[model samples]
Target: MEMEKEFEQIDKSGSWAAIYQDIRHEASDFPCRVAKLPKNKNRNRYRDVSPFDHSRIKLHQEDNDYINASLIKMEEAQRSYILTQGPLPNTCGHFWEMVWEQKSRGVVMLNRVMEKGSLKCAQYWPQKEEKEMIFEDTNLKLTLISEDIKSYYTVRQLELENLTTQETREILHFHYTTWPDFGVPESPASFLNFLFKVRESGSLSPEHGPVVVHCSAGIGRSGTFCLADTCLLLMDKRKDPSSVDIKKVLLEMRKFRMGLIQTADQLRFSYLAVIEGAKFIM
Candidate 1:
């Protein structure tokens, strides 16, 4: 009750703006020198959203081991999520390589390939017309085994192969197709449904390396997803679920990657999702 009312008061009073600003100010100084290197510049989807050097995932196979991905660890929730940018055309191979090396079981995509008359993310996986697609640079192949479509999301079964060693692994792709052009979801119920679908699969469990989470910039929507999910998990472990602080959790996430929860609305949505999701576990 306390946390819910606090979020409600924040929403009614429009205090997310100040809260969002405070997070930005505090996370502004982390070192991100690698993303600025001349050779790695084009690999980034956005110039400003770089992974922190300490927490960034390094690609072992590539000479230039740079990918716009951050490993965000929520020790309390017993979870680690790889938050990254949508693959650039050239970096698609590297994206798969990261998955291969990291041994991730799931990829949660929050944006469409094309958004607002521009390419927000590359079409990184195989389509129905082509059962499999290969990336020569990384010697990897992706086979689209099956797909399940819903009103607001799609679940895909993909088999990723390493052409070099002929080793293959199965991975699930969870794509949320209905985030509005410039806003949050219509309601948290539909979003929560999709979230638990992923949760129940056990892909997010500690046995896996980390679930890959990305949107256009890998900050706004990606951050929202991780923040809400982490908060709910923390609440589930607590005797008093309402004792968890949403703002503190977001700040902790932003420490690993800059500019998480880009807008005030995104920050508010995190709260809404957390508040709504608590009903299930609490």
Candidate 2:
């Protein structure tokens, strides 16, 4: 009962707006450079989508190609997630290479292929009957085994094989189709249900490598998802609904990946989701 009041007090304080401004100010200094190297020269189709040099993901095989991806590790939750921009037409191979090399078990896609008359992401995955889609640069092949479509999301089973090593591993592709590009979901109940669905599938488990999470730029909606999930987990770990500090955890998460929780609204929604979900878990 008192915990609910504390959350409400935080919400009423309105310090988040000022903090968000500070976050934006600091993020402005991050280098969003697109190098003219062969591998990364044209990987970023859009100029706005560039990886931070300090925390960017570098492929063992390619030095310069930028995938706009970063590794985010939440030590307390024992979870690691790869937040990245949606795959461009050219960087699709590099995307698969990152996943394969990282040994990721699931790809949590939060954006649709097309939105508001714009193509936000490439059709990176294969269709059920397309047989297979091959990436020439990295010598990788992706095939769609099956797809389970829910009202708001889709779960796909994809097989990724490294042609060079002749090694193959299956991957889960969880696509949240209804989520707006820069907005929160309809409600925490809907979002939590989708979250637990992924949890039940063992995609977010520690045994697997980092789960690949992305929207268009991988920082807005992606941040919301990770923030909410981590806070909820923290509540569970502490065995109390009010023990988690959402802002502190977000800052800790941003250390691993810059520009998380892109908008103040997203941050606010994350807190709302955390508080709402905690009621059920704790």
Candidate 3:
């Protein structure tokens, strides 16, 4: 018998739940899972310290190290993964180091990666110096393999540079949201449009491999975008929305990487956005 490749598209008032469950069941082996990062519980204790770099604090030292190590291990295992954050948390340095250390161990690290960053405003374009600073602060250049990769369109150019092998044609880019404070409903839609266009133009192929996406901590925006795409695939198959479950999908994503959709707001937004996207696609 031929393997079933298509999934049912669900369209019901509470179909989001079923969709989530279906995704969880289908993606049982995915490397990442969806969960929230530990919150800074003792907000009143800090005066001049960065919450992100609290490993130096004696009380939080052990907790910090544990989270950091867990995140690095996730990255190593899921070589092709997506993260949604502005800059990777300082904790992920171990992951970068491991990738370098295992370069010759047949662990061809990501050849294509995509990033999403928080913008200051919809109209904010970087001055030359500002652009340099942003790139430097984000360590974008170090992510690349060569300067030529920087010459392509903003998105793919970044990916090309960071690839481990020159033989690969895949590239990644850092995507920006139109609004910094609140994400635009159209952002995910635009990304899917771009994906389809690339496929149509023959610039992307399944054989090229999966594209990696990361923002800062790999949850909120990253998870939303990834989930949106998955929902699109389900809708394409005309799946019955009534039978799908969103929580199950979120849980499954968590099982893969720990924090797929980290916040309640992010989760709700992604759920709604994907439904809107399906409507648009239909």
Candidate 4:
């Protein structure tokens, strides 16, 4: 009910767009340094999309890159989330190479392999029965060891093998399927619950490698998830979540990725989720 009312207010006043504009203003002069790398010219499917200079991944593994991926660090929260766009059919191997190189404990996927019509994200993981999906370019084999399907998300346990080294590591795949493109979730409860589910596995802990998070473009939904998680963690540590600043946090996060929230409603939902999550922590 409150969310609906907030939406109505945001729609009527257009304040959210104004706030987003301010964010873009703050990010305006911040260069997209690798905006165009002569060697990786066509790596990105979308010409306009590029990683921010300061936070772009070195891609030491690929000796190449996404033009769309960036490393987002929430220092105080001890959280490191690599936010990137969905893997294009051609960049799929490079995507796996990233996971392998980053030593990512899990992949938090917010978009489906396909949406209402066309492909939103490539089918990056192996099929359940297939046991393995090999990325020939990266010299890696990602084998599916197990899977759990729920109403809103699916969890898969995959074994990513470094074929050349004969080394392997387990990677958890958390795919949230019901979220809409550039839209907020239906409610905060279910989304918060899903957030905690990912939290429980300890895959996102500070001890492990940064968790990889993505959606079609990797800004809107991915940013919301990271924002909510970081805010809630801050509240837990500060022991005073009531003082949380949603807009301030969003702006800071945008330092690493452009256009963190795609829609006004998503920004509103982030605030609501933070408050809802604060309930228990408080």
Candidate 5:
């Protein structure tokens, strides 16, 4: 009804262009001193994309506590998310270290391991046959316990072990396999459904630390996921779906991290997902 009408309105090129441009103008640029440091240069996959100093996650256990990850806290929605770049070959240990220290229960991966002829992300997790991966540098070992494959996604149950302390915990890995090479997904339903599945596990709740979400640079697709999830949660909490302002919510999220919802298309898809997702919650 209302969502459908709103969707139709935004679908128009003129209206959407104005809205997207406004958001671009509203996005602020914050200092990323650590990311620009000489020593920490290689830690960031993309030099241009770095987490803001105020909200970047610090690794207490490691010698260099600078991981290119941000703690995005949307308190109104009762949600906290860690938006980070894909793990670099060298920072694989730090990637798991952040997960252990944060006590994150689930990881939502938006990009594929490889895209086109280039490598988008390091194969941080172990293959099924390999069974286990030992990051000797960090004394962290990840063992693959189970894998459930779907048409467009794969969910894996992984065991995270701290060989130093001999403590272990279970981590759920949700890998979305179909985000296209050029732009956003074909439709929002699959993305929303994948999001609902992550919610069903109760992993995104306040009981745990923030859920770690990553694409390549941790801004575009990762931003879209967090934005949609937060707006949907806010909608359900208010019991008034129409009150959720997608633009305002996105602006708030960008304050914590850098560029989120990279293009106008991704922003539009977020709106579509929220509108379509509102049907079940309301």
Candidate 6:
């Protein structure tokens, strides 16, 4: 008599529970949380680049039950733009001037800034003579500058250089929807282990200083990483997976930061990523 085949079956029952358990364990590692800044009230508006002293930018420190946070309030004369962490010459008259120089050099800055502020902040379309003068005056070396409030100051500079490959990795690099493959794979154990390896070896760390994370339109992917990382820390602390409250935890995150993964798909992906046995059952 022929034996029955194993059915080549996919077991889905325990997958959710397994993911829940993994999240619980992962979250336990970092119990302290950081909230996102609100959106509407916190507008990324443009302003004229008045020649006000940089001292006008007020920096304040505030503490919470979770992590220490700070804010760098922009003056009417200035605006903010985002840039990748990479090696560059350091020459600064103002933030905008440096940004202009970076753009001229073909560096892709990711953060959006106020247009009017751009005009006042730096001399645009520099003439040959002016360019020479500016270059000589600025150091233009790749350096990291953080505001008094702990936010990064420069638009772009080399933050982390992967030693294995000379290629520079920005603080925010676009991995673009790599989640589906990694999170829901044939072997959850292997997938999780892969993520662990990247996190362990990767140089992205708040301990070094505040690092900005943004994606296209400054939302989605950025939010996912932050939430998943935060959740992982929480899970690690509780030890008991059954007690994880993903929604409550995510809400807390949103209170501090706005648009933490703006899309529902991204949010679901975050949850799915931390699920313990998602890969195994599928």
Pairwise TM-score winner, candidates 5 and 6: 5
In model 6, the number of clashes is: 41
Cα lDDT computed for each candidate against the true fold: 0.86, 0.78, 0.34, 0.77, 0.87, 0.31
Q: Considering every candidate listed, which one attains the maximal TM-score? A: 1
Residue runs of model 6 more than 4 Å from their true location after superposition: 1-140, 143-198, 202-206, 276-282
* Model 5: per-residue Cα lDDT over 10-97, one tens digit each: 7864487678888989897899998889999899997337999999999975468899999999979989999999999999999999
In candidate 1, what are the lDDT values of residues 143-206, reduced to their tens digit? 9999999998999999999999999999999999898877888688878888898898777998
Give the runs in model 5 whose Cα sits over 4 Å from its true position. Answer: 1-4
Best by lDDT: 5
Quote the positional error of residue 208 for candidate 3 in Å: 2.9
Each prediction's Cα RMSD?
A: 1.5, 2.8, 10.9, 3.1, 1.6, 15.3
Model 4 regions more than 4 Å off: 1-14, 61-67
* Winner by TM-score between candidate 2 and candidate 1: 1
Q: Residue 164 error for model 3, in Å?
A: 9.2
Could you give me the TM-score of model 6 versus the true structure? 0.38
Question: lDDT-based ranking, best first?
Answer: 5, 1, 2, 4, 3, 6
Q: TM-score winner between 2 and 5, please give it.
A: 5
Indicate the worst ten consecutive residues by lDDT in candidate 3: 103-112
**How would you encode candidate 3's per-residue C-alpha lDDT over 88-143 as one tens digit per residue?**
33423322332222221111111123224433111111223224212222122223
Candidate 6, overall lDDT?
A: 0.31
**TM-score of every model versus the real structure:** 0.96, 0.88, 0.45, 0.89, 0.95, 0.38
